[PDB]
Design a protein around this ligand. Structure first.
Ligand SMILES: *[C@@H]1O[C@H](CO)[C@@H](O)[C@H](O)[C@H]1NC(C)=O
Length: 536
């Protein structure tokens, strides 16, 4: 050093880092990108828990994003921004265990509350370097210290021969925990306060967050939690040990393969062979179901998430949870016949019955009959527009809205302070059709404050809206309460309780308080539907 910027030189446990000064709309921020937190989980390390990164010599250049974890790349609509924005934006590699830090410039003298982003992508995709996860706005405008990590997805992160030593499962979750541990030890070097660490994530990221809540060794590494459109409970976020064992041996057979010998052989396969076959192991034709996800291993997860939330002590827990207006629409174009981004996707009653079997792939004939009965509008049972919207609701309710209601209910009843929302604003810049409404993941760009960038063509109301949400999120991170104590009655956001079931709408209009999160419909999914499949 000598002629470099004094604010960009930081030491952490493993060594020295040089960051980059980035431009945010209202001023500069500090960014430390591609900091390694684990030994590269390659070769013999594939499928194994991450080993902490051994110290390096010299000043590590931390000015660009690092590799994206090896994964399937979406190809449904080549060139289309609505799909591309989620696609990897750096080289794919198994050497991908890096994290990123954004802080104010110059970095704060007093310790700042830390926000840790965990991305979604169904546990088969995702990356902390996507444009919608850009922490520079939260860091600049709200003065937050923001951290995001890469964690292994797909087989690399989740293939499991439960019980075995060499592929124990949930190692993608262990990548996340390692980064949480890195934050406890090192974030103070950046002005972050390790005693104020808020986790937030969306979809599989939300479910990830939910699992750190449920896994005791993670609990001491954070203080509050936001779960956007995702939960550890529910039908897609976990598989049983038996089912993970089944999928893992099938996948092994498909690429050419005693647990030790199986895994040893899997380790000799190129990463791309594994990705090519990962979608061939699902039990049924389905949507919103993924091959390699967290397993109920009796270790990281001591029991099913359903069980752990029913019987858990959440006294000292503040939690913000919510959903978007149309949780189910996104995946309809991915495997329900009749649906497409290129038309209105008006469907027949026949396509609707078939859709229900794909969207509730684990339902018996009788349970699917129940779903169809509940969601049919018997005044117009053949109306194509209703049926299209009902198909979307079935998928969204079953996968997100009802797991979230279930989760919010159990947490509130068991000590937790819960705040709940529904996000209803459709980005003026959205490229998916109008019929898809506000699909899942399209609140994110607002929370991270992308509309503050003039070159992005968000409306002025959207720029103001984004700031409202950044305030809610960071107030929550700071205090456990999304409301601003200064600005009183504008109006208030009440906690969600089992008595009143209050939640707020998030849109361009001021906060509106509503009651019951699909209460009737969620009774169907959460109370009745299990008892039906518990007697078929
Ligand atoms: C933003 O604004 C200009 C004018 O409409 C347009 O040419 C450009 O493509 C827009 N960028 C985005 C993000 O679509």
């Amino acid at each position: 050093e000598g002629r470099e910027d004094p604010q960009l030189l930081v030491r952490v446990r493993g060594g020295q880092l040089r960051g980059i000064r980035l431009k945010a709309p209202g001023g500069p921020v500090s960014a430390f990108l591609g900091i390694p937190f684990a030994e590269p989980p390659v070769g013999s390390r594939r499928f194994m828990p991450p080993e902490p990164k051994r110290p390096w010599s010299g000043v590590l250049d931390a000015t660009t994003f690092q590799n994206v974890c090896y994964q399937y790349v979406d190809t449904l609509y080549p060139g289309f921004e609505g799909t591309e924005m989620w696609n990897p934006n750096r080289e794919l590699s198994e050497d991908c265990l890096y994290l990123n830090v954004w802080t104010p410039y110059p970095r704060p003298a007093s310790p700042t509350p830390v926000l840790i982003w965990i991305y979604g992508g169904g546990f088969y995709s995702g990356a902390a370097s996507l444009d919608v996860y850009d922490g520079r706005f939260l860091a600049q405008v709200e003065g937050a210290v923001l951290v995001s990590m890469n964690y292994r997805v797909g087989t690399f992160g989740f293939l499991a021969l439960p019980g075995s030593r060499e592929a124990p499962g949930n190692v993608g979750l262990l990548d996340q925990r390692l980064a949480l541990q890195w934050v406890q030890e090192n974030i103070a070097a950046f002005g972050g306060d390790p005693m104020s660490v808020t986790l937030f994530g969306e979809s599989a990221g939300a479910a990830s967050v939910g699992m750190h809540i449920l896994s005791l060794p993670s609990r001491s590494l954070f203080h509050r939690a936001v779960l956007q459109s995702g939960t550890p409970n529910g039908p897609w976020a976990t598989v049983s040990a038996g089912e993970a064992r089944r999928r893992a041996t099938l996948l092994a057979r498909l690429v050419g393969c005693n647990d030790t010998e199986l895994i040893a052989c899997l380790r000799t396969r190129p990463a791309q062979d594994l990705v090519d076959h990962e979608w061939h192991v699902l039990p049924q034709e389905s949507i919103f179901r993924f091959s390699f996800v967290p397993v109920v291993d009796g270790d990281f997860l001591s029991d099913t998430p359903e069980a752990l939330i029913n019987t858990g002590d959440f006294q000292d827990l503040q939690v913000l949870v919510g959903v978007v207006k149309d949780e189910g629409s996104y995946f309809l174009v991915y495997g329900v016949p009749g649906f497409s981004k290129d038309n209105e996707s008006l469907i027949s009653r026949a396509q609707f019955l078939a859709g229900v079997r794909i969207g509730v792939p684990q339902a018996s004939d009788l349970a699917a009959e129940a779903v169809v009965l509940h969601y049919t509008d018997w005044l117009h049972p053949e109306d194509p527009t209703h049926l299209r919207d009902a198909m979307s609701a079935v998928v969204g309710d079953h996968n997100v809205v009802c797991p979230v209601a279930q989760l919010a209910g159990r947490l509130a009843a068991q000590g937790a302070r819960v705040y709940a929302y529904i996000f209803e604003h459709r980005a003026s810049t959205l490229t998916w059709p109008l019929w898809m409404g506000v699909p899942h993941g399209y609140e994110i760009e607002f929370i991270f404050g992308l509309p503050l960038d003039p070159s992005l063509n968000y409306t002025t109301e959207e720029r103001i809206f984004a700031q409202r949400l950044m305030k809610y999120w960071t107030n929550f991170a700071r205090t456990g309460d999304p409301n601003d104590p200064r600005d009183s009655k504008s109006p208030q956001w009440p906690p969600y309780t089992t008595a009143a079931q209050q939640y707020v709408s998030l849109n361009l209009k001021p906060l509106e308080v509503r009651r019951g999160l699909r209460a009737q419909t969620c009774a169907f999914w959460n109370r009745f539907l299990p008892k039906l499949l518990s007697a078929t």
